[PDB]
Amino acid sequence: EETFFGNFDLASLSLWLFYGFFALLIYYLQTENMREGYPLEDEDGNTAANQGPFPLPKEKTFKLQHGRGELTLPGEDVQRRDNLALRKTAHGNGFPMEPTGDPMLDGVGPASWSKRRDVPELDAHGHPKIVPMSAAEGFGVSAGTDPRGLPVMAGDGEIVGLVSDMWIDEAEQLVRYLELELDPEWGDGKRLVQRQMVRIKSDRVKVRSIYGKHFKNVPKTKSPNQVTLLEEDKIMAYYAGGTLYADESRLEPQL
Amino acid sequence: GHVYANAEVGVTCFTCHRGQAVPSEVWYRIDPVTENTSGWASVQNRATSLSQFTSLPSDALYQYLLNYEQIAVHDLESRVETLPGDPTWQNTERTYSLMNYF
Amino acid sequence: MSKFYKIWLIFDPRRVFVAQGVFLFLLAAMIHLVLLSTEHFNWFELAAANA
Amino acid sequence: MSKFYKIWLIFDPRRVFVAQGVFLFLLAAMIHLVLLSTEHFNWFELAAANA
Amino acid sequence: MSKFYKIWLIFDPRRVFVAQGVFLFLLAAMIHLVLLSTEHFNWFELAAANA
Amino acid sequence: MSKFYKIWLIFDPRRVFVAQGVFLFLLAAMIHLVLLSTEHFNWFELAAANA
Amino acid sequence: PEYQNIFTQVQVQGPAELGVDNENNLTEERTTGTGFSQLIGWIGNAQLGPIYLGWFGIISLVTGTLWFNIVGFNMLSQVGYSIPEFIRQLFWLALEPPSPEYGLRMPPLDDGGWFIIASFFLLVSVISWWLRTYQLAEMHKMGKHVAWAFAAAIWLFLVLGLFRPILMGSWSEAVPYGIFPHLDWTTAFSIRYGNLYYNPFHALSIVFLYGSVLLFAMHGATILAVTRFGGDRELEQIYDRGTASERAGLFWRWTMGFNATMEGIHRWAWWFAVLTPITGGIGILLTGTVVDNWFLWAVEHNFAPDYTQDYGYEAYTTYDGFLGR
Amino acid sequence: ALLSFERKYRVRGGTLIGGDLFDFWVGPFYVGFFGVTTAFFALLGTILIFWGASQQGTFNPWLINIAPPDLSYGLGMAPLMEGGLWQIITICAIGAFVSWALREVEICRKLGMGYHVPFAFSVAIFAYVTLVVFRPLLMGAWGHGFPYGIWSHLDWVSNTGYAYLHFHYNPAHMLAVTFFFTTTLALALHGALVLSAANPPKGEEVKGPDNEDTFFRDFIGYSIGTLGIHRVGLLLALNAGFWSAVCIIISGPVWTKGWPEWWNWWLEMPIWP
Amino acid sequence: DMTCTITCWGIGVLLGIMTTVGLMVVGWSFLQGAFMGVLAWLIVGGVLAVAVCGKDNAEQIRAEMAAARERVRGAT
Amino acid sequence: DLSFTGLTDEQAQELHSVYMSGLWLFSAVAVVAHLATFIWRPWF
Amino acid sequence: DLSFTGLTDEQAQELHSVYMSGLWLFSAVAVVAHLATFIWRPWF
Amino acid sequence: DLSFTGLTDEQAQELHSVYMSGLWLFSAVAVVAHLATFIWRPWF
Numbered sequence A: 001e002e003t004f005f006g007n008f009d010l011a012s013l014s015l016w017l018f019y020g021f022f023a024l025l026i027y028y029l030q031t032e033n034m035r036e037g038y039p040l041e042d043e044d045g046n047t048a049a050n051q052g053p054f055p056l057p058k059e060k061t062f063k064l065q066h067g068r069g070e071l072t073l074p075g076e077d078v079q080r081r082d083n084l085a086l087r088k089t090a091h092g093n094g095f096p097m098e099p100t101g102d103p104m105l106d107g108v109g110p111a112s113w114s115k116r117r118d119v120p121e122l123d124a125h126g127h128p129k130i131v132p133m134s135a136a137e138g139f140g141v142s143a144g145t146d147p148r149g150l151p152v153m154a155g156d157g158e159i160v161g162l163v164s165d166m167w168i169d170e171a172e173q174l175v176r177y178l179e180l181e182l183d184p185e186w187g188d189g190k191r192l193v194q195r196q197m198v199r200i201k202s203d204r205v206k207v208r209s210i211y212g213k214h215f216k217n218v219p220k221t222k223s224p225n226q227v228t229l230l231e232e233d234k235i236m237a238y239y240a241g242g243t244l245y246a247d248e249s250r251l252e253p254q255l
Numbered sequence B: 001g002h003v004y005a006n007a008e009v010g011v012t013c014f015t016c017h018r019g020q021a022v023p024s025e026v027w028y029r030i031d032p033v034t035e036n037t038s039g040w041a042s043v044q045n046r047a048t049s050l051s052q053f054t055s056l057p058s059d060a061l062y063q064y065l066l067n068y069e070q071i072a073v074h075d076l077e078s079r080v081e082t083l084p085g086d087p088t089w090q091n092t093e094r095t096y097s098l099m100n101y102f
Numbered sequence C, D, E, F: 001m002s003k004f005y006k007i008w009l010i011f012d013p014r015r016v017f018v019a020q021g022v023f024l025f026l027l028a029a030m031i032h033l034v035l036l037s038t039e040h041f042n043w044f045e046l047a048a049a050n051a
Numbered sequence G: 001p002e003y004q005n006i007f008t009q010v011q012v013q014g015p016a017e018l019g020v021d022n023e024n025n026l027t028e029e030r031t032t033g034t035g036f037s038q039l040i041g042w043i044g045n046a047q048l049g050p051i052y053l054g055w056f057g058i059i060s061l062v063t064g065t066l067w068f069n070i071v072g073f074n075m076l077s078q079v080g081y082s083i084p085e086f087i088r089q090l091f092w093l094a095l096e097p098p099s100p101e102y103g104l105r106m107p108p109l110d111d112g113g114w115f116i117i118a119s120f121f122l123l124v125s126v127i128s129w130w131l132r133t134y135q136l137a138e139m140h141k142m143g144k145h146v147a148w149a150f151a152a153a154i155w156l157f158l159v160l161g162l163f164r165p166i167l168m169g170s171w172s173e174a175v176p177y178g179i180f181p182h183l184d185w186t187t188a189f190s191i192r193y194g195n196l197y198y199n200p201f202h203a204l205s206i207v208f209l210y211g212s213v214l215l216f217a218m219h220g221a222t223i224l225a226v227t228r229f230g231g232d233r234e235l236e237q238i239y240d241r242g243t244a245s246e247r248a249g250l251f252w253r254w255t256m257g258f259n260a261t262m263e264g265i266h267r268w269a270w271w272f273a274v275l276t277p278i279t280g281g282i283g284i285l286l287t288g289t290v291v292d293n294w295f296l297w298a299v300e301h302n303f304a305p306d307y308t309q310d311y312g313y314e315a316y317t318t319y320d321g322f323l324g325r
Numbered sequence H: 001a002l003l004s005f006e007r008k009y010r011v012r013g014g015t016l017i018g019g020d021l022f023d024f025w026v027g028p029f030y031v032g033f034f035g036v037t038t039a040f041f042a043l044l045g046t047i048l049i050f051w052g053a054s055q056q057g058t059f060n061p062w063l064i065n066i067a068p069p070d071l072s073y074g075l076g077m078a079p080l081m082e083g084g085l086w087q088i089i090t091i092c093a094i095g096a097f098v099s100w101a102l103r104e105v106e107i108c109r110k111l112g113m114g115y116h117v118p119f120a121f122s123v124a125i126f127a128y129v130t131l132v133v134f135r136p137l138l139m140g141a142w143g144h145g146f147p148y149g150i151w152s153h154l155d156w157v158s159n160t161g162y163a164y165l166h167f168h169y170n171p172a173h174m175l176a177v178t179f180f181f182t183t184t185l186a187l188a189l190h191g192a193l194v195l196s197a198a199n200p201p202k203g204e205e206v207k208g209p210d211n212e213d214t215f216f217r218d219f220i221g222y223s224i225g226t227l228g229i230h231r232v233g234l235l236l237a238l239n240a241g242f243w244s245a246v247c248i249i250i251s252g253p254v255w256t257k258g259w260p261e262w263w264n265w266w267l268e269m270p271i272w273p
Numbered sequence I: 001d002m003t004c005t006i007t008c009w010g011i012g013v014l015l016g017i018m019t020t021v022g023l024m025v026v027g028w029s030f031l032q033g034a035f036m037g038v039l040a041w042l043i044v045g046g047v048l049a050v051a052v053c054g055k056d057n058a059e060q061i062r063a064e065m066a067a068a069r070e071r072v073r074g075a076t
Numbered sequence J, K, L: 001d002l003s004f005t006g007l008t009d010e011q012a013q014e015l016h017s018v019y020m021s022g023l024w025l026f027s028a029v030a031v032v033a034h035l036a037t038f039i040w041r042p043w044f
């Protein structure tokens, strides 16, 4: 085989062509990932002077099922929160924020939730996706330990009530939530706990994220037979906020 | 040039024989190792006493250390015009088996 | 042309300035390095030889 | 020329200062290192040879 | 030159101080290590040779 | 020089003391090990060679 | 400690799911009969089956079975039809490619005919499977990304088996059908043509393989980390952004200065995985046809390292000193 | 410059050590105690590498080579030009990797999520430490580590592989290669399925998890689910790393002869006639 | 009833170790004994888990449960 | 009046004055160093 | 006054006094140790 | 007036005074050390 000029042959041509293609592909991949969260803002809520070297992409349209309309991105932020109880700890940018009231009750920090749609998620048939186990026909426990009837222990060793039901995902045959009936001392009504934050034992179910006194302020569902995306977000994040805000020692340095 | 390579080391009867009438590590010809095979498929794909626990050709030690066949397989330029009769990867495998034996 | 000021109605000055700033330094470094890789224009070796 | 001060209506000084400092330190380090890879201007070896 | 104090209206000391603290120690450590890797300025081998 | 006490109006002493202690102990350990890694100053080996 | 979501605490079982349908009538070809495995339910889904039986699938199954049986019976006959010896030497037998002397002509059955027949069957089976994977996506109303990613690997498959032997003008350039023989072929191919390390496209394919493994590790860890916010339901997060996506993006933005979206990370994963066989096939296709020695190519192109020290054990130690005498 | 949803997450707390002394951001990056340590170690290592490159006589990225000492120095320290710079850079790299992992831990704690990512990074750190620390320590010399060069760290791999005659016959190498290939295939399939579900042909509605489940049950007769696939991928990657470490660590200090000969236990079982 | 299955798996592991040591005693090597021991582990553990742990606890529920399937059959 | 950073004209002038004041000092120190180095070992 | 930590002027002065006393004691001990080491085995 | 950090003019002047006071002491110590090192082993 011969060379076109100097040491340049077919392999070098292929290598340079691949270099060009890879550069274009990297540009495309980076630009495709800027459809959420832009343009950038400063710490006062205003548009920043610097926006980066990659310009914004063009628009694309999603056609959603069940007649819920269309979604076009990039666009305005419809999940934006309105009034946040936060305070700046400095006059410039690059410094943390300070909660104004109760961070667990105000939904800030690790307890933050997003403003999702106030409608339940639907399966292929158009039914609510997550349903209590007492309304699902033909479903039963096949393995593991049944948590129904067991007492619930909080993060500080307090028993707050019993597990009364489970909320399952009928389409995927997976358990999503555990329902809890509270003792009159610790509150009233029923509360939901996501399955990812519980440890089922032979005689008890333990929730280490929050303490006993934090159980009465868990967000409640409006309907007893379904839950919406907004409620799931608020319930699930309230439970996540306790890993930091349930005690003063969880926030200060461990050393 | 080989036995006196580094010092005065010779050879006697007690180098192949070690008290035996037959010196150990003598070899024979076992080239057909499979059945219903004709060419390159009739010498390698089996673990035998001449292959060193591999599937490499057992035809070695007979084409090289008894007959006079080429061992080199490499090309001496980055780009070379390939012709029929040039070494292939099968000759490379027979050399790999010889060097495993070494 | 007298009307070459309309390029700033098509392009954003900030991105252009950043890209040009990178480009100029890269070009200058490449040219100096290409000069250093020869024999007639390497000033370090020329200074060494004349000493 | 008398209007070069209008560059700060386009670029934020806080980012420009950091970028300029990083660039200047890197350039100085690169030059000081390039001088040490030769024999005529390597001051450590020259000090060794003159003693 | 008499208005250099205005840099503190641009930068908060809480970040500049830590940046400078890291930079100075990095510089000192590299310089000492670079000195330790030569033959004319290595003060550990000099003591052994002198004794 | 007489107003160096204002450094505690910028940094929290509680979070500075721990870092200072860690830095000092690590530096001392590094220097002792560096001394141990040589031949002239390895006090464990001079004890054996002397006797 | 906290629950880590690696094994499921309690399982539930309901009526079996038969599958969605549309006017294309997918039901007419699906089988009837399902099972449940509690052992697998600790990790993933427990339902097993049903499967879709088209014509491409049946053709592929039959033809691949024919290839398997041909290879197995040839290997069995090569040993004398001895079952204990067939079991003993299973990893060492193979079905060898033809001899170099026959060029591209059809060789005798003893020296490569069965190899060609089995290769033809294997090619037919693979193409049938690809057609099936295209047809299924066409009938469920979905994109054809799965077909493209399979075609990415089929490209390297064909380059290793079909295109390169034709370009080199010999059927002896293929790969033998065996466990240890195919590794032997890999090593011999690497040795014969210089060093395959210095082939730039082998390096590029290695880069993309490492990146793909790293990216799945990162993505699996990230998704399991934010699963307490319903992060495993990725499609609903794409359609309606929640807090899980925001936290997952902010983690990587604070870690390395840039992040992705819930839909854009899958594009990254698809491309890193697909780019490996493409570069590998491009690099393999150039060996022998264009470049015959890759170390000499590297030396001529000035990226081969140079060493100053000497060679041999006598430059560093003594034979008696090594033994301790 | 923040994202439009980032400000409410930028709160204080969640530090293992340091409190508010280093609790701030520099651009997008988060700074802490371990960020400071990482910056120091990485900068020192890079500058030392370029100093060694300058003293070598070349600045070509392809040709820079920093090598470990000779085998005669044992486990002691070597002159900084004859391989001591390699030891210093190794120490710096270990420190930087550990600091990076702990910074990831701090970020995870602040965001209120799980600690899976640092645990996954720990396996790669373990593999690197096995390559540069454990195996040379067992073999008895720091000269068994690989050099720090782009093209010179492949010659080491080649020579180490050929030191056992045929490294493809190593069973742990087989396991690791199989895990690597399986991980790549699983990643490709997962990405393709998600992208196809979210991007239908023009004029068609988007799909859901039920559609994906049906597709793979029609395709191969089984579906792992939207949650099991991530577990499977994570486990595959971790297993690949672990078995790579095992394969490299058994080659030198445990086995000494060629790898093909290891199969004589199977080839010489008493059950065979 | 996963505990019984884990117990059966542990019994299989112990039996594999015992068989491996016995094979050392007979005169085999380490790997030759280990392969047969692993075989024994998987086979005996699987057999015990399927058989013994398949006897789920029931005294009179089993009979009516057995009798119930004797009525579904015969008319289908 | 164009402004992307939110500054005023007078603020920009006052900033540029001090910026150039520092730049000239940096350049003067560099020039003195270069002169001393050239006196020590020439390159031209 | 300016304070990012919450301390006052008097408290900062009081803290700095004790900090400097400890620093001086540490420096004196280090100086004595260095002098003894130099007498035992002199570098430079 | 331009102020990104929220400080006033007098506070910035005081801060600069203390910073320069520290810098001069650092530089003086470095100069003394360099003079001693040059007397011990010259590099010019």
Ligand code: BCL
Residues within 6 Å of the ligand: G186, H097, H124, H125, H127, H128, H131, H157, H158, H159, H160, H161, H162, H167, H168, H173, H176, H177, H180, H241, H243, H244, H245, H247, H248
């Ligand atoms: C003659 C050559 C021999 C051979 C000899 C060897 C030897 C010898 C080795 C293996 C190793 C491996 N072999 Mg093998 N191997 C051969 C050919 C093959 C073939 C093939 C023919 O197809 C395959 C598929 C493989 C594949 C493999 C993997 C199983 C394994 C790679 C380790 C790994 O990925 O750990 C990945 C882990 C890491 C080391 C990652 C470390 C990352 C660190 C922690 C972070 C980096 C930070 C960085 C500096 C940041 C800076 C960047 C900033 C942005 C600036 N081998 C041939 C047959 N093989 C290697 C192995 O198992 O190593 C343990 C090894 O050493």
Ligand code: BCL
Residues within 6 Å of the ligand: G122, G126, G153, G154, G156, G157, G160, G186, G187, G189, G190, G196, G197, G201, G202, G205, G206, G209, G276, G277, G279, G280, G281, G283, G284, H157, H181
């Ligand atoms: C001594 C060995 C040589 C070497 C020789 C080779 C050779 C030769 C090759 C590789 C190739 C590769 N090398 Mg290399 N390589 C070496 C050292 C290494 C090392 C290392 C030391 O760590 C690494 C990391 C690797 C790894 C790699 C990969 C990057 C690459 C494989 C591409 C791929 O996607 O494979 C994945 C495999 C495939 C996609 C194959 C196609 C699969 C098809 C689709 C199968 C169809 C299904 C089937 C018919 C049905 C089965 C039955 C079912 C159960 C129904 N090499 C050394 C230097 N390397 C390949 C390459 O591309 O290099 C350019 C290649 O050919």
Ligand SMILES: CC[C@H]1c2cc3[nH]c4c(c3C)C(=O)[C@H](C(=O)OC)c4c3nc(cc4[nH]c(cc(n2)[C@@H]1C)c(C(C)=O)c4C)[C@@H](C)[C@@H]3CCC(=O)OC/C=C(\C)CCC[C@H](C)CCC[C@H](C)CCCC(C)C
Residues within 6 Å of the ligand: G031, G033, G034, G035, G036, G037, G038, G039, G048, G049, G050, G051, G060, G061, H219, H220, H221, H222
């Ligand atoms: C890596 C992907 C490859 C693959 C995977 C694959 N196929 C699978 C599975 C998996 C992981 C199953 O779990 C499922 C199965 O039933 O496995 C036992 C199956 C399957 N894929 C099949 C075929 C098949 N797949 C193919 C494709 C592939 N298989 C891919 C290439 C091909 C090819 C290449 O042509 C064929 C021929 C079927 C045999 C089966 C579809 C299941 C079905 O239609 O009915 C099964 C259901 C039952 C009637 C009862 C369960 C079956 C049990 C074996 C009996 C009882 C066991 C008990 C209920 C629990 C099982 C215990 C577990 C440990 C399994």
Ligand SMILES: CC[C@H]1c2cc3[nH]c4c(c3C)C(=O)[C@H](C(=O)OC)c4c3nc(cc4[nH]c(cc(n2)[C@@H]1C)c(C(C)=O)c4C)[C@@H](C)[C@@H]3CCC(=O)OC/C=C(\C)CCC[C@H](C)CCC[C@H](C)CCCC(C)C
Residues within 6 Å of the ligand: G060, G061, G063, G064, G065, G068, G125, G126, G129, G133, G146, G149, G150, G152, G153, G273, G274, G277, H181, H182, H184, H185, H188, H189, H220
């Ligand atoms: C992006 C590149 C990666 C990749 C991708 C990839 N592979 C793919 C795909 C994709 C996207 C598919 O869609 C396709 C698939 O079906 O995946 C589930 C496939 C596939 N890649 C496969 C293998 C494979 N991929 C590999 C690698 C890779 N593929 C790359 C890493 C490798 C290697 C060497 O690393 C291999 C060996 C198959 C599992 C499958 C292709 C299936 C196929 O072509 O089947 C044809 C049919 C036959 C040959 C008939 C076989 C008959 C048998 C004798 C019996 C029936 C099968 C049975 C299930 C096995 C035995 C079971 C026992 C219990 C009896």
Ligand SMILES: COC1=C(OC)C(=O)C(C/C=C(\C)CC/C=C(\C)CC/C=C(\C)CC/C=C(\C)CC/C=C(\C)CC/C=C(\C)CC/C=C(/C)CC/C=C(\C)CC/C=C(\C)CCC=C(C)C)=C(C)C1=O
Residues within 6 Å of the ligand: D018, D022, E018, E019, E022, G218, G219, G220, G222, G223, G245, G248, G249, G252, G256, G257, G258, G259, G260, G261, G262, G265, G268, H026, H029, H030, H031, H035, H036, H038, H039
């Ligand atoms: C679904 O979910 C998911 C997401 O979401 C939706 C995701 O997104 C992702 C993420 C995935 C992707 C984005 C895909 C792309 C990813 C890859 C291809 C992986 C490979 C990545 C890379 C090659 C890039 C990685 C880059 C690295 C590690 C380098 C970056 C680091 C630095 C520049 C330094 C770090 C900064 C520190 C430590 C802070 C600074 C230190 C201090 C002490 C501050 C003090 C001040 C100073 C020192 C001075 C000022 C400092 C400056 C300016 C810093 C710069 C300094 C320099 C010297 C240059 C995944 C997986 C996911 O599943």
Ligand code: HEM
Residues within 6 Å of the ligand: B071, B072, B073, B074, B095, B096, B099, B100, B102, G191, H165
């Ligand atoms: C164990 C694996 C070995 C491998 C992979 C290997 C590889 C090779 C290869 C490929 C060649 C031919 C090179 C060419 O084409 O020019 C060769 C030849 C040679 N090798 Fe090695 N070798 C090995 C071991 C050894 C050992 C241990 C010796 C010991 C003395 C050795 C000595 C030689 C000699 C003398 C030649 C020249 C043969 C000739 O051209 O006549 N090799 N080796």
Ligand SMILES: COC(C)(C)C(=O)C/C=C(\C)CC/C=C(\C)CC/C=C(\C)CCCC/C(C)=C/CCC(C)CC/C=C(\C)CCC=C(C)C
Residues within 6 Å of the ligand: C004, C006, C007, C008, C009, C010
């Ligand atoms: C020898 O063989 C090898 C392969 C090695 C070769 O070397 C092969 C080489 C080739 C095949 C080469 C081929 C080269 C070409 C085809 C070259 C073509 C080049 C051009 C068409 C160049 C066009 C350049 C145009 C320019 C410079 C335009 C400038 C315009 C402006 C500066 C004005 C910008 C416009 C404004 C501001 C619009 C006003 C705005 C308003 C809002 C009104």
Ligand SMILES: COC(C)(C)C(=O)C/C=C(\C)CC/C=C(\C)CC/C=C(\C)CCCC/C(C)=C/CCC(C)CC/C=C(\C)CCC=C(C)C
Residues within 6 Å of the ligand: E017, E018, E020, E021, E024, K044, L029, L032, L033, L034, L035, L036, L037, L039, L040
């Ligand atoms: C963290 O952020 C902030 C802003 C707070 C900072 O930046 C803070 C920074 C600090 C707190 C920094 C602190 C720094 C120190 C405490 C530094 C101390 C330095 C020394 C004590 C240095 C001593 C150096 C001594 C040397 C080099 C001695 C050399 C001796 C010889 C070479 C022997 C030969 C002697 C001869 C020939 C005698 C002749 C001498 C003559 C002077 C003529």
Ligand SMILES: COC(C)(C)C(=O)C/C=C(\C)CC/C=C(\C)CC/C=C(\C)CCCC/C(C)=C/CCC(C)CC/C=C(\C)CCC=C(C)C
Residues within 6 Å of the ligand: C028, C029, C030, C032, C033, D027, D031, D034, E003, E004, E005, E006, E007, E009, E010, J014, J015, J018, J019, J020, J021, J022, J023, J024, J026, L002
């Ligand atoms: C030889 O070949 C090779 C490639 C090896 C080379 O070595 C090539 C090298 C090059 C090509 C090098 C090129 C180098 C350059 C182009 C360098 C340019 C450098 C500059 C322009 C530097 C400018 C620095 C200016 C400074 C530091 C000025 C002032 C700073 C300050 C005054 C700081 C204080 C600021 C205040 C107070 C402003 C606040 C004011 C208010 C009113 C708020």
Ligand SMILES: COC(C)(C)C(=O)C/C=C(\C)CC/C=C(\C)CC/C=C(\C)CCCC/C(C)=C/CCC(C)CC/C=C(\C)CCC=C(C)C
Residues within 6 Å of the ligand: E028, E029, E032, E033, F027, F031, F034, K014, K015, K018, K019, K020, K021, K022, K023, K026
């Ligand atoms: C040779 O080359 C290499 C690289 C190998 C090197 O070895 C290089 C080495 C270096 C470059 C080393 C550099 C070292 C330094 C810069 C070291 C600096 C050290 C210090 C500045 C140390 C300071 C120590 C201060 C101390 C100990 C102060 C106080 C201690 C107290 C116990 C006081 C307690 C205070 C109280 C109680 C206050 C309470 C008051 C109230 C009002 C509540």
Ligand SMILES: COC(C)(C)C(=O)C/C=C(\C)CC/C=C(\C)CC/C=C(\C)CCCC/C(C)=C/CCC(C)CC/C=C(\C)CCC=C(C)C
Residues within 6 Å of the ligand: D028, D029, D030, D032, D033, E027, E031, E034, F003, F004, F005, F006, F007, F009, F010, K002, L011, L014, L015, L018, L019, L020, L021, L022, L023, L026
């Ligand atoms: C030779 O080649 C190679 C590459 C090898 C090199 O070695 C290259 C080397 C270089 C290129 C080196 C370059 C070096 C520099 C540019 C160094 C610069 C150094 C400085 C500018 C140092 C500044 C130090 C300043 C200090 C120490 C100031 C103050 C310290 C204080 C402790 C004061 C603290 C202030 C307070 C408390 C104010 C509080 C006031 C209130 C009102 C609250």
Ligand SMILES: COC(C)(C)C(=O)C/C=C(\C)CC/C=C(\C)CC/C=C(\C)CCCC/C(C)=C\CCC(C)CC/C=C(\C)CCC=C(C)C
Residues within 6 Å of the ligand: G068, G069, G070, G071, G072, G073, G076, G116, G119, G120, G122, G123, G157, G158, G159, G160, G161, G162, G175, G176, G177, G178, G179, G182
């Ligand atoms: C007899 O006993 C029974 C019945 C139990 C059996 O049947 C036993 C069977 C066995 C024990 C079987 C064992 C089988 C193996 C160990 C098989 C191993 C197979 C491989 C490693 C195969 C690799 C194949 C291919 C490779 C590596 C690359 C590329 C190949 C191709 C592209 C093939 C395609 C061929 C083409 C396109 C050429 C066709 C020719 C034409 C003229 C069209």
Ligand SMILES: [Fe+3]
Residues within 6 Å of the ligand: G223, G234, H190, H194
């Ligand atoms: Fe995913």
